[PDB]
Amino acid sequence: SAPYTLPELPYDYSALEPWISGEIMELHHDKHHAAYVKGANDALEQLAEAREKGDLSKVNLLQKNLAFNLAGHVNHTVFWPNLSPDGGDKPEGELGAAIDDAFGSFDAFRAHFSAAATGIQGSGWAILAWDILGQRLIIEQLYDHQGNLAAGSYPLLMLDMWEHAFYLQYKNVKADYVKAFWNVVNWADVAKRFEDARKVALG
Amino acid sequence: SAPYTLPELPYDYSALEPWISGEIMELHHDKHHAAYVKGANDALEQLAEAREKGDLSKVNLLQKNLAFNLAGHVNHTVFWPNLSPDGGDKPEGELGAAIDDAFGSFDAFRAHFSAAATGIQGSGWAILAWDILGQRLIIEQLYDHQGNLAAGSYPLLMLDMWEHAFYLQYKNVKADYVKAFWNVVNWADVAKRFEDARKVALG
Amino acid sequence: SAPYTLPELPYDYSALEPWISGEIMELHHDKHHAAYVKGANDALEQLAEAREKGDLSKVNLLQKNLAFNLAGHVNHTVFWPNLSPDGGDKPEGELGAAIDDAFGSFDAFRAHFSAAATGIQGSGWAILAWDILGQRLIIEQLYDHQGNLAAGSYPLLMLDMWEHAFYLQYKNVKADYVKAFWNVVNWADVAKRFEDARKVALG
Amino acid sequence: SAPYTLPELPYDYSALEPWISGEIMELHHDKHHAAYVKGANDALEQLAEAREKGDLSKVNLLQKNLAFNLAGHVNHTVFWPNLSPDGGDKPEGELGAAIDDAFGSFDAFRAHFSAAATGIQGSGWAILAWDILGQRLIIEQLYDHQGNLAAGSYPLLMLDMWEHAFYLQYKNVKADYVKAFWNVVNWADVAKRFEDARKVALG
Ligand SMILES: [Fe+3]
Ligand SMILES: [Fe+3]
Ligand SMILES: [Fe+3]
Ligand SMILES: [Fe+3]
């Protein structure tokens, strides 16, 4: 099947200023995300080579390379369209109602998501996801790209808390980055994903 | 929405002998899985309490408790019907063809899955999953319940490599447990999940 | 440098009964610890080969194999002499006084240590250690063998909470294993370790 | 016991230019290291409170906060004096001879160390350490601050590969940061640490 590819940004590289700089968007998308695409394709290619030669002695390496890079690729693929120069404000419609039901209010959702974002020790993400078993909205606090999450959980809104996502602009003051993020959230994009996710069940 | 519950086993507790003992099935399902159900419901209840009282200072604890227990619950929910007293043999139909295409052959799939299973350092799982971004079959080697995996990946076939899943019968000789597992795989169940998973895309 | 070797047990397999079975002690020492010794020697051999042949692209694998196996070897090397058929009771002398100072009382230390032991999510350890920077006693809750700890911290008392350490005897009821453990702690060994540790500083 | 404190830098912020910028050194030491000092003291205070008030159900959180922050404090405490404006060149004397014996040559040590540094998937460190069991030099590739290492191993030379350590200057090009690092290694400091380490045994 077709290899992974780097998706293009769906807005100008400087479209998210003054909240996320064009300097960051260029490095983050063009360099960091590109590396995951290559790493994910390479992990699959190397696993196919291992199977074909009958030597799976490096399986642990290949499986971590696969998880790390595929997770990085999935996470950034969702992240870019989650942002918009026409973003901000609050979720509406069925997504807004579901957030009120799952978290109490938009304010409480935001406070929980923000606390999950700033609490990470090392690299990671705060995400809103749909649990396909319970058929419900949850927040997950990812470690690196591929840890601290349940299988099947379907990503809806991502916030990258790796230092490369904010350091050039905000230095160590990551809370100011988290606050800025709310200005650029593309709730229409999150709503489309929610429509897709709600059709998925574990079985 | 409705709380998580413990699913019943879909066969007799001793149905998988001599491959997995009834002694293990009873403890593993009735005690271990029950604990994840309670832990997952409790994590959500405690997160709701934290939001309502405006104190998210324990978010890191609650988010790991959620990930660990929800992942445990998802993983075992898929695991039980993945096994059957009428299991064994090989995948057929579109699932069999997809495994041949993704892994080269059933033998190569089995060798890769087995190597992933025995290579774990600590607790974990070998799983066959559908990557919802690439629309393709992959193996993932999970750490504990909730690590070393990509968001969205949809579980199809699980092998629990926590020591509680095999120690009473096989002691330290986990390779013999992995070999025994192939005798009880419910390929019809895996095929149904694959039919469900193939309808899911990241977007 | 000389290869790592498996230390002998300082007592007969059954010497810790009824608290820890001879059945477990034999498997645990003769099979599990032996595998970490081999794994640690193999990791060093493979690192030397990778340096010599130019294969340091495998470094992440080889360094995880080294950490996991060397940590397992270290941890079990401390564990066996930490137990004794003539143990139990309480720490005395300077060790007893330091535990009182650091934790409040022996009973409070036991409550904290026991909570760290039973709380592990996955495989791990509860340990008492000397922090060589702060020159003070701490508990550390290790993940697997090699996670959740500070460099230099010097192990004094170990409790193995991997399921292989207790499952055959206590099944899922790890609190009963932890309760049993206190009857076999070799406080004289812990005290010797403490004397050695207090001479170590980070500098 | 006395609370942890932030050690002063042994040189001016800009003393490592052009290899590591004063801009980074100031943020890194004055903001990031300060936070680990506070976090480590806070973790110990919160553990004492949990013991006293009966709240050890929070033990997993408090022990992760302790490990993460104490490890960060340890690691940076070693890092600053490991660097010098009068460094670079090569290890000599007994340290140089031991590196030749353990790694083949200084050049082979540098290749291994550099591969461990650039290979990290997430935040972490490459370190040279003394294994207090085997009485030998090893490299360890730390995850975050507190992962992928063996208890007791005594740190000699640290390279911080968290993105905050290099991003403002080197952006995503971490190989150029690692190349730069060799020009500022304080081999006299590493040699002192090695003298101290060789007197430590696991026992
Ligand atoms: Fe990123
Ligand atoms: Fe299980
Ligand atoms: Fe063990
Ligand atoms: Fe740092």
Numbering used by the authors:
A (entry chain B), B (entry chain B), C (entry chain A), D (entry chain A): 2 to 204
The publication says:
The crystal structure was solved by molecular replacement using the previously published crystal structure of Fe-PfSOD as a starting model. The metal center in both Fe- and Mn-SOD is bound by equivalent residues, being two histidines and one aspartate as equatorial ligands, a third histidine axially coordinated, and, most probably, a hydroxide as a fifth ligand completing a trigonal bipyramidal coordination polyhedron. This TfSOD structure was refined with an iron bound to His29, His77, Asp161 and H165 and two solvent molecules (W1, W2). Herein W1 has higher b-factor compared to the other ligands and Fe ion, thus W1 is less accurately defined. Even if the TfSOD is resolved to high resolution at 1.25 Å it is not possible to assign one of the solvent ligands (W1, W2) as hydroxide ion from the observed electron density, still, it is an option a hydroxide ion is present as reported for other SODs. In high resolution TfSOD crystal structure to 1.25 Å, the iron has octahedral coordinated, and the quaternary structure is tetrameric. To confirm the suggested Fe cofactor, EPR spectroscopy was conducted, giving a spectrum that was comparable to the EPR spectra of Fe-SODs from Desulfovibrio gigas, Themosynechocccus elongatus, Escherichia coli, and Methanobacterium thermoautotrophicum among other. The EPR envelope display g values of 4.90, 4.23 and 3.60 that are characteristic for a high spin ferric iron in the enzyme active site.
Superoxide dismutases (SODs) are enzymes that catalyze the dismutation of the superoxide radical anion into O2 and H2O2 in a two-step reaction. In this study, a superoxide dismutase from the thermophilic bacteria Thermobifida fusca (TfSOD) was cloned and expressed before the recombinant enzyme was characterized.
